[PDB]
Ligand binder design. Structure first.
Ligand SMILES: *CCC(=O)N1CCN2Cc3cc(C#CC)c(-c4c(O)cccc4Cl)c(F)c3OC[C@H]2C1
Ligand SMILES: Nc1nc2c(ncn2[C@@H]2O[C@H](COP(=O)(O)OP(=O)(O)O)[C@@H](O)[C@H]2O)c(=O)[nH]1
Ligand SMILES: [Mg+2]
Length: 168
């Protein structure tokens, strides 16, 4: 059957996890998406000439351990670590999420990409150097995105797919 990639999008409330995922699948920018709705989404893509089906968990709600999140964390192949460039706390929260994923994987070498979202906004509080430093510390790529303009959205997901290929 068609190759699949199981992806997980994680990050603080409000950073744009749903908006990024909706842009990828639908090519529309959502100004409001219910923060409680945790679901998976599927998209057929072609990346470096390979047709595949992405299976993407948009994490949401507060109720952490849940049938769905548990199975995607245990079986997920790659993770997008999303913060917003106007949300310093969301950047500070990234290390927590990376630590929890590493503990589920019992591994230091999990495919991940750091995503700094909301690049269209004036109110930057996390500088690109802070992002780049963090990603280099972790050994992973950094991609700047805007779900509003769509800048970097494909690049983020495709880079994650390329990172999974490099690992397996
Ligand atoms: C605004 C609502 C929303 O989008 N979310 C609420 C905050 N969530 C934070 C968050 C926390 C953890 C944890 C822990 C301990 C994890 C997680 C879990 O649950 C299990 C294994 C690995 C990790 Cl990283 C999150 F994925 C996560 O991101 C979701 C965010 C959703
Ligand atoms: N300006 C701008 N707003 C965004 C961007 N991404 C998300 N938003 C907005 O930020 C809010 C939170 O987005 P959402 O996708 O619900 O975040 P989630 O809680 O991580 O799923 C919503 O009002 C979105 O429209 C972006 O790149 N730029
Ligand atoms: Mg959401």
């Amino acid at each position: 059957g068609m190759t699949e990639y199981k992806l997980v999008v994680v990050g603080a409330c409000g950073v744009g996890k749903s908006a990024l995922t909706i842009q990828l699948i639908q090519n529309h920018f959502v100004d409001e998406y219910d923060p409680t709705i945790e679901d998976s989404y599927r998209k057929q893509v072609v990346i470096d000439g390979e047709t595949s089906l992405l299976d993407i968990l948009d994490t949401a709600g507060q109720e952490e351990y849940s049938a769905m999140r548990d199975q995607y964390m245990r079986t997920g192949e790659g993770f997008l670590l999303v913060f917003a460039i106007n949300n310093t706390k969301s950047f500070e929260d990234i290390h927590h999420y990376r630590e929890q994923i590493k503990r589920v994987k019992d591994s230091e070498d999990v495919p991940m990409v750091l995503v700094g979202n909301k690049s269209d906004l004036p109110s930057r509080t996390v500088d690109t150097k802070q992002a780049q430093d963090l990603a280099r510390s972790y050994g992973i790529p950094f991609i700047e995105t805007s779900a509003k303009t769509r800048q970097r959205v494909d690049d983020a997901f495709y880079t994650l797919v390329r990172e999974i290929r490099k690992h397996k």
